[PDB]
């Protein structure tokens, strides 16, 4: 059984598309889309956005178990993400695109959800990212490292208000995000503050990207 998608590369499949991996165990699979092309491939994608059709302003339960279609936009699920990061060391890459036919990205050497936590729920599925290699976009996620995942259901942020509610999304929020890759798909520039799919360091808080996907590969 392949538990990640770098295993699938070893299984003998190299065309990027929908694939089944067994992160829990052989009992139940979960489909994901894998980017076997970018930088040699072997990328497991836990996040896709482009059409804007699927709404990412969902609850904590949908974000734990995951929601969406592996074909188009989806979210793999925080629990599944934890099973991968718990048993293997992983590398992070996020790929972004605006409405001006420009591409950008940012890479982080280490990436983990609630590392060395006896139970991910109790720890709120903390996000940890280490050494950052710069691509097109800046470094927004290093601001988020060490923060529990928050939703309008469950406020874990360090802000007196519910930063998840103000940002129209879910993320590992601090006082408030520099990256809200689950914000509302406002499709271009917007006069509201920091509530769309925003990467602060690349296009600021008043610009909503067109495409977004967060990729993961073995060590």
């Amino acid at each position, epitope marked *: 059984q392949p538990l990640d998608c*770098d295993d699938i*590369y*070893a*299984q*003998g*499949y*190299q*065309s990027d598309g929908v694939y089944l991996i067994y992160p829990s165990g052989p009992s139940v699979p979960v489909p994901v889309f894998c980017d076997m*092309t970018t*930088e*040699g491939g*072997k990328w497991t994608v836990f996040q896709k956005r482009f059409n804007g059709s699927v709404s990412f302003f969902r609850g904590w339960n949908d974000y734990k178990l995951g929601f969406g279609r592996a074909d188009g936009e989806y979210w793999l699920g925080l629990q599944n993400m934890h099973l991968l990061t718990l048993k293997q060391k992983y590398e992070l890459r996020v790929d972004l695109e605006d409405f001006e036919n420009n591409t950008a990205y940012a890479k982080y050497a280490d990436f983990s959800i609630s590392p060395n936590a006896v139970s991910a729920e109790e720890d709120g599925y903390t996000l940890f990212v280490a050494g950052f290699e710069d691509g097109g976009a800046g470094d927004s996620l290093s601001y988020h490292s060490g923060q529990k995942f928050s939703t309008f259901d469950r406020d874990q942020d360090l802000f007196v208000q519910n930063c998840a509610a103000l940002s129209s999304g879910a993320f590992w929020f601090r006082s408030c995000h520099f990256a809200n890759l689950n914000g509302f798909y406002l499709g271009g520039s917007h006069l509201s503050y920091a509530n769309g799919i925003n990467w602060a360091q690349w296009k600021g808080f008043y610009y909503s990207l067109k495409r977004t996907e967060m990729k993961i*590969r*073995r*060590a």
Partner: antibody
Amino acid sequence: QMQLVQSGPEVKKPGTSVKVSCKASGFTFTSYWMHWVRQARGQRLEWIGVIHPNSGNTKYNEKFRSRVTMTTDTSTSTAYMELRSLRSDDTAVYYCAREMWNYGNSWYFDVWGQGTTVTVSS
Amino acid sequence: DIQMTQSPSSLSASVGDRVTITCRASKSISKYLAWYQQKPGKAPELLIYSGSTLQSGIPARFSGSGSGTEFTLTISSLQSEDFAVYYCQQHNEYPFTFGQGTKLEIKR
């Protein structure tokens, strides 16, 4: 030891087909990807395509599609490559090579056969 | 698509010398490149991979560097085993091109 044993050389007329074998030993054949590369004498090496024995998936070079077809016999741990319609310029040495795995780009060949000199002429 | 052109076409140097070979890319190829060593009538042997990382068992004097369009392979001090033909491969994209080949010969 990790070794790839290719077939002996063949001399073919133009337009005919040739079938080159490449048998693996010293490593589990089903785990690693297999590449095919040709080296025309005093010229640049050309990457033919790739095949994985376990799945049978293939990915060819654009210019060789329709002409070359790759197969694998899992029982004998052998990889086959066959060029259907031959052309006088195809005279070259054909290698089979194994792609190592290495937690990233990979796509580089750590273990090679030893060449199958193919001569095509009327 | 993504031609690879090596330089110099032929190089002559003596043992113990510092030698440098360069591989050029037509289009942006990123960090990823690999080098090979082909002895006469032998299969190529892999030396460097992903631009700067060397394969296990290769001597420490072999080293690779470069990024983007230009890459270089350098050897601290040659040895009799080092004289051969060296090839540069594309590695980043899936057309997969190879280098023109560089003759490294002994100088008398």
